[PDB]
Design a protein around this ligand. Structure first.
Ligand SMILES: Nc1nc2c(ncn2[C@@H]2O[C@H](COP(=O)(O)OP(=O)(O)OP(=O)(O)O)[C@@H](O)[C@H]2O)c(=O)[nH]1
Ligand SMILES: Nc1nc2c(ncn2[C@@H]2O[C@H](COP(=O)(O)OP(=O)(O)OP(=O)(O)O)[C@@H](O)[C@H]2O)c(=O)[nH]1
Ligand SMILES: COc1ccc(/N=N/c2cc(OC)c(OC)c(OC)c2)cc1O
Ligand SMILES: [Ca+2]
Ligand SMILES: [Mg+2]
Ligand SMILES: [Mg+2]
Lengths: 426, 436, 155
């Protein structure tokens, strides 16, 4: 339980995946060339989780970069850390997928999937004890959604005993008003329920509303949204990259966060919410469970928490954190299921993120996430009832029954969240 | 002299094992390199401390202990700690991947890949014994390795060592310093599977040790180091009769004779007094009567329960230090005039007394002050059924919804084993109710 | 049969092919198997010019398919603001109802086409119109937590 193989697919997957490496390298003391410039030994103690150590004390991210669009590869290399990636790990096709889930999953991306699996095996066999795989992608496109889910299925076949973790970006008309995105998202959710052990739901609807209404950014860009993503991806992986009082790994997270196999979609939250350019412990605990701080556009007070994991970063009293966390569970006791005792776990890490002194990252398995899937299901149904643009998919080998099964499995997932939201202990 | 082998399973068992053996050395005068100057016979012997320590030709005194864990982080700290030269390197066994807080991983999948190596190393220590009497097993309830692997180990030990006794030191889970949500699952699963392979089990309630650290030692937020130093002081008081000359509980058989009237009800309650903070170095010394009265206060017990709600089936008082036997008699005669102490109709309503006239040793760096006299009370009371009731309730809340069960079934375990383990716990509760 | 060719030319966006077929007698109001007309397909695929040329040659702006969808329904669903205004200027029924109870305001609200929502309101969209489940356009905004959409409906 040590090394994680990171994969990123599509424009969104490579864009937010690049920012992820820029953030954690800055926290570990790694420069764009790959040398350790840090001043604390706690930065290299678990550095092997995400990086491969080469000769000359040179750390290389254990990352695989995939996309059917060749243009995304050039934008990554022109980035600040574009040179730190192993050039053999760039697997880029010739023609894009054109926001078509059927292209990435059945035609175009199916031709390139074997070229990606070869790079996965080479990285996996270079691991002392492979922990699992980490994928970043969007669900609204064609490559990260169609081929991303295809990659998950094949990797799941060859490495069935390893954890599959995704950072999946949910589509929103407020950001990209392309009407086939509800198709691609629903088809991917059908795949994510079966083939992933834990999924972080990052909602562009939530990211936009945070930038527009909270950060007062009049016209948010992808960089404004990705700033919130990288801060969240840094927080959720803190206990994997630093020692701490717990030997946390991807499997211990899944065992203690996922009470039922299908309900493995997490609602992440971050505090404080800052923007590029611009705090007590009771403020962090309060602001963490606030609906405005959730990276998924859902009100947690409309559902119940099945499991909650909270990460605090910075200098603070672990007794005060224990007292404040125990306070929130009493005022909001009705928002926690009572048939899972001690379902809130807290970790404190000394090293805080860049530009911040106090941080609070929230990972919740809440039944309120059904609001996210109800939204996508309604848009999907509005399009699917009129059979709009269905030939874009059926013309690539997709059977029309695959849409009905994705919709059915989508609605079944919502019913299961509602089922445990209403269940009591008696 | 009959040798005893200690087995330390999982993080809790290893770390508690580290603090115990450190204390054992200070009590016996053994240096971190294994040298014991007061040992007149070099290369062997028949003294009482030889039950726990073997001797090499070079005068080195090696613990009869095996450390096992499915991941190496915790055990690696022993390989580089203060007592790294004390243990055989082959006694410290580590895997690569732990049980992920999953009983089934520790018992069925991951545990099977190292079980045979552990037994072969145990057999190596057993062959060096002239009269092996049994094993002491240290492990947690809530850990995947501490529960899943321990159950697997105790099963194989009953086959290879049928007549030998097996004693447990188990760590009862507490919400304050817990690790996993599924710790109630692992606790019930390992209790059901080990119940028939264990002759006597001393439960340590982490919540009880936690509160004693806050209230008696004035430690605001206790850590595993604070709890384990206190726990080792109690474990030392329980095993002192095996390592020193004495008249009470001189071997593992007398533990069951004195504390276990029936096999299934083999969970004695331990009480330790006095627990004084090291900052109060010039504290007044408590009398025999004062520390004896403290053994019947619920605030001094290693498991949270009310002995006034239950009946006693056995009671052993182990004293250490400046203790005149006639003062114990008078102190007991006062306890016999208390309604809070009720014995069952069928047991001889008496207290067994054993006195070691050496005061307790304190570890440098510990939170405990030196005392001239201390007492550990080992008693079998039906009030410890409350601890099983709290654990069964947490199990029932999650299992009624079948929460987290797929993680166990996915590791080669039939779902019916949950109900079979739960029904056995329901039977254990009735065993206490039928007694009292 | 030129009706089938006009249907494909309307979907594909072949402006010149549309003018040639109409000049040779092609049925402007021809329907496919599901009742879609060239105006339906042109409004679905965002061919603004073909929408205009069809309306100048006797295209029924309020034609419905088997599911009761008008061209305004599909234009509001896909999000073609310019086509929506052209249809409204040529007499499209802003409150037309399909077999699911949906008005063009319902579809524009569900898909987040806020600018189209404003245009439909400016032309008399019924905010009190319910679908087959009793949901109005304002109910949809409240249910999915769309504050931006809820403001527009209260103007
Ligand atoms: N938050 C965030 N979302 C993004 C970003 N880039 C794209 N998206 C979202 O991703 C969705 C479309 O998926 P893309 O990743 O752009 O497309 P793809 O996965 O490469 O597949 P193709 O469309 O065939 O190229 C849209 O809904 C976008 O809003 C980004 O940098 N940040
Ligand atoms: N008293 C005490 N309790 C501990 C210690 N370490 C862990 N625990 C308790 O043990 C339980 C978790 O079991 P562990 O022993 O840590 O897990 P494990 O046996 O290594 O098995 P894995 O799941 O594979 O890690 C929790 O309830 C902890 O409170 C310790 O050093 N002292
Ligand atoms: C709900 O209760 C639990 C959940 C997970 C548990 N341990 N696994 C991890 C713990 C983490 O933070 C506390 C963490 O950081 C978020 C993590 O990142 C991988 C793993 C233990 C629990 O008791
Ligand atoms: Ca000797
Ligand atoms: Mg793209
Ligand atoms: Mg462990």
């Amino acid at each position: 339980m040590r090394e994680i193989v990171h994969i990123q697919a599509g424009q969104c997957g490579n864009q937010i995946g690049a920012k992820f490496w820029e953030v954690i390298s800055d926290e570990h003391g790694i420069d764009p060339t790959g040398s350790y410039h840090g001043d604390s030994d706690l930065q290299l103690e678990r550095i092997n989780v995400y990086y491969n150590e080469a000769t000359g004390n040179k750390y290389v991210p254990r990352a695989i970069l995939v996309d059917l669009e060749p243009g995304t590869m050039d934008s990554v290399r022109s980035g600040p850390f574009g040179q730190i990636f192993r050039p053999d790990n760039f697997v880029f096709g010739q023609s894009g997928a054109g926001n078509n889930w059927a292209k990435g999953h059945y035609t175009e991306g199916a031709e390139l999937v074997d070229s990606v699996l070869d790079v996965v095996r080479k990285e996996s066999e270079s691991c002392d004890c492979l922990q699992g795989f980490q994928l970043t992608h969007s669900l609204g496109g064609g490559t990260g959604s169609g081929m991303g889910t295809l990659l998950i299925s094949k990797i799941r076949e060859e490495y069935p005993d390893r954890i599959m973790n995704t950072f999946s970006v949910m589509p929103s008309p407020k950001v990209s008003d392309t009407v086939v995105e509800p198709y691609n998202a629903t088809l991917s959710v059908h795949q994510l329920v079966e083939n992933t052990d834990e999924t972080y739901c990052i909602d562009n609807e939530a990211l936009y509303d945070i930038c527009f209404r909270t950060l007062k950014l009049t016209t948010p860009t992808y960089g404004d949204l990705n700033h919130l993503v990288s801060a969240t991806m840094s927080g959720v992986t803190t206990c994997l990259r630093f020692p701490g009082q717990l030997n946390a790994d991807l499997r211990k997270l899944a065992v203690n966060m996922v009470p039922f196999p299908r309900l493995h979609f997490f609602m992440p939250g971050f505090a404080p919410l800052t923007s590029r350019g611009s705090l007590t412990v009771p403020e962090l605990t309060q602001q963490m469970f606030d609906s405005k701080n959730m990276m998924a556009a859902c009100d947690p007070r409309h559902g119940r928490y099945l499991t909650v994991a909270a990460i605090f970063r910075g200098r603070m009293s672990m007794k005060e954190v224990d007292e404040q966390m125990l306070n929130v569970q009493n005022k909001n006791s009705s928002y926690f299921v009572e048939w899972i005792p001690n379902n809130v776990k807290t970790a404190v890490c000394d090293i805080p993120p860049r530009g911040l002194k106090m941080s609070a990252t929230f990972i919740g398995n809440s039944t309120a996430i059904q609001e996210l899937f109800k939204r996508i299901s309604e848009q999907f149904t509005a399009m699917f009832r009129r059979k709009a643009f269905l030939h874009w998919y059926t013309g690539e080998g997709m059977d029309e029954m695959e849409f009905t099964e994705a919709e059915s499995n989508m609605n079944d997932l919502v019913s299961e969240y509602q089922q445990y939201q209403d269940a009591t202990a008696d | 002299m009959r040798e005893c082998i200690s087995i330390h399973v999982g993080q809790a068992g290893v770390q508690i094992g580290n603090a115990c053996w450190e204390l054992y050395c200070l009590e016996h005068g053994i240096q971190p390199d294994g040298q014991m100057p007061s040992d007149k016979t070099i290369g062997g012997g028949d003294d009482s401390f030889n039950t726990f320590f073997s001797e090499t030709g070079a005068g080195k005194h090696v613990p009869r202990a095996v450390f096992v864990d499915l991941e190496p982080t915790v055990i690696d700290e022993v390989r580089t700690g203060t007592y790294r030269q004390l243990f055989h390197p082959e006694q410290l066994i580590t895997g690569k991947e732990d049980a992920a807080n999953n009983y089934a991983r520790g018992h069925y999948t991951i545990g099977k890949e190292i079980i045979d190596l552990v037994l072969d190393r145990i057999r190596k220590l057993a062959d060096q014994c002239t009269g092996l009497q049994g094993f002491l097993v240290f492990h947690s309830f809530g850990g995947g390795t501490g529960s899943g692997f321990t159950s697997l180990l105790m099963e194989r030990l009953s086959v290879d060592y049928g007549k030998k006794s097996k004693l447990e030191f188990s760590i009862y889970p507490a919400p304050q310093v817990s690790t996993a949500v599924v710790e109630p699952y692992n606790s019930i699963l390992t209790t059901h599977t080990t119940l028939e392979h264990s002759d006597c089990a001393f439960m340590v309630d982490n919540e009880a040790i936690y509160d004693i650290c806050r209230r008696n030692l004035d430690i605001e937020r206790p850590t595993y180091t604070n709890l384990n130093r206190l726990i080792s002081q109690i474990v030392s008081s329980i095993t002192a009769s095996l390592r020193f000359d004495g008249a009470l509980n001189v071997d593992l058989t007398e533990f069951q004779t004195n504390l276990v009237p029936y096999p299934r009800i083999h969970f004695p309650l331990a009480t330790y007094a006095p627990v004084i903070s090291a900052e109060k170095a010039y504290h007044e010394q408590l009398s025999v009567a004062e520390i004896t009265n403290a053994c019947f206060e619920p605030a001094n017990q290693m498991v949270k329960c009310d002995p006034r709600h239950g009946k006693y089936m056995a009671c052993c008082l182990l004293y250490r230090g400046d203790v005149v036997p006639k003062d114990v008699n008078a102190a007991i005669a006062t306890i016999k005039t208390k309604r809070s102490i009720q014995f069952v109709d069928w047991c001889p309503t008496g207290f067994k007394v054993g006195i070691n006239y050496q005061p307790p040793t304190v570890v440098p760096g510990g939170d405990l002050a030196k005392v001239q006299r201390a007492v550990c009370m080992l008693s079998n009371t039906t009030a410890i059924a409350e601890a099983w009731a709290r654990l069964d309730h947490k199990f029932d809340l999650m299992y009624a919804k079948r929460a987290f069960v797929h993680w166990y079934v996915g590791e080669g375990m039939e779902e019916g084993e949950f109900s079979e383990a739960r029904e056995d716990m329901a039977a254990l509760e009735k065993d206490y109710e039928e007694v009292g | 049969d030129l009706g089938k060719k006009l249907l494909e030319a309307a979907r594909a966006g072949q402006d010149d092919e549309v003018r040639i077929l109409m000049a040779n007698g092609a049925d402007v109001n021809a329907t496919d198997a599901s009742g879609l007309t060239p105006l339906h397909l042109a409004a679905t695929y965002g061919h603004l010019e073909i929408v205009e040329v069809l309306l100048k040659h006797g295209a029924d702006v309020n034609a419905i398919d088997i599911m009761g969808s008008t061209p305004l329904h599909l234009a509001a669903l896909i999000g073609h603001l310019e086509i929506v205004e052209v249809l409204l200027k040529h007499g499209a029924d802003v409150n037309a109802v399909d077999t699911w109870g949906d008005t063009p305001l319902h579809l524009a609200a569900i898909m987040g086409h806020l600018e189209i929502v404003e245009v439909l309101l400016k032309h008399g969209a019924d905010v009190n119109a319910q679908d087959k489940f009793g949901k109005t356009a304002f109910d949809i905004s409240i249910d999915n937590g769309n504050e931006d959409l809820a403001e527009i409906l209260q103007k």
